[PDB]
Design an enzyme around this catalytic site. Structure first.
Site, PDB file in Angstrom:
ATOM      1  N   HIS A  36       0.913  -1.122   0.054  1.00 54.02           N
ATOM      2  CA  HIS A  36      -0.063   0.023  -0.079  1.00 54.02           C
ATOM      3  C   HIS A  36       0.879   1.197   0.006  1.00 54.02           C
ATOM      4  CE1 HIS A  36       1.124  -0.288   4.175  1.00 54.02           C
ATOM      5  NE2 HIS A  36       1.119   0.968   4.126  1.00 54.02           N
ATOM      6  N   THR A  38       0.571   4.978   1.953  1.00 53.26           N
ATOM      7  CA  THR A  38       0.184   5.885   2.981  1.00 53.26           C
ATOM      8  C   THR A  38      -0.175   7.343   2.258  1.00 53.26           C
ATOM      9  OG1 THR A  38       0.734   4.525   5.063  1.00 53.26           O
ATOM     10  CG2 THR A  38       0.038   6.826   5.177  1.00 53.26           C
ATOM     11  N   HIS A 106       5.703   6.797  -0.489  1.00 52.37           N
ATOM     12  CA  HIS A 106       6.473   5.434  -0.787  1.00 52.37           C
ATOM     13  C   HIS A 106       5.498   4.266  -0.641  1.00 52.37           C
ATOM     14  CE1 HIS A 106       6.217   5.827   3.566  1.00 52.37           C
ATOM     15  NE2 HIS A 106       6.529   4.644   3.870  1.00 52.37           N
ATOM     16  N   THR A 108       6.208   0.520   1.016  1.00 48.57           N
ATOM     17  CA  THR A 108       7.320  -0.356   1.747  1.00 48.57           C
ATOM     18  C   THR A 108       7.360  -1.608   1.466  1.00 48.57           C
ATOM     19  OG1 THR A 108       6.973   0.885   3.993  1.00 48.57           O
ATOM     20  CG2 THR A 108       7.699  -1.354   4.058  1.00 48.57           C
TER      21      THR A 108
END
Length: 137
Positions: A36, A38, A106, A108
């Site tokens: 995902h 954020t 970003h 992860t």
């Protein structure tokens, strides 16, 4: 409570991100269902309206380590995305807070790379499938 918003990705984008994880042999890879980006991480809650539709939001990114609050060295794909920055600014305009010096979109890829290092710039069509909004612990 707080407010958390993130974007999830199309099947083709997820396939490309998992290929990046496998090809780099990352330890502690993020599971497919958990990939995902954020948008909002706010200690206060606002009536953010999740997006509708699907389209490309970035076409490349760079690897960087973002240390977590527990001290883990997480490896991320950092993007420049006009879309995500605009959605973060929409939340801010509604009143959301973000208690960090900068918003750096970003994805992860590994929770914890230990003592390892990874460097690279990747071309990945990052296609938004949907945003989700939920309460933040």
């Amino acid at each position: 409570s707080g407010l958390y918003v993130a974007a999830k990705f199309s099947e083709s984008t997820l396939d490309a991100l998992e290929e990046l994880q496998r090809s780099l042999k990352l330890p502690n890879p993020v599971p497919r269902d958990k990939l995902h980006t954020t948008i909002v991480y706010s200690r206060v809650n606002v009536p953010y309206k999740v997006a509708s539709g699907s389209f490309e939001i970035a076409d490349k990114g760079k690897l960087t380590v973002f240390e977590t609050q527990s001290g883990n060295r997480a490896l991320v794909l950092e993007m420049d995305s006009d879309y995500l920055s605009a959605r973060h600014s929409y939340a801010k305009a509604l009143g959301a807070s973000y208690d960090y010096p900068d918003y750096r979109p970003h994805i992860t890829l590994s929770y914890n790379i230990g003592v390892l290092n990874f460097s690279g710039e990747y071309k990945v069509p990052v296609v938004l499938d949907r945003e989700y909004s939920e309460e933040l612990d």
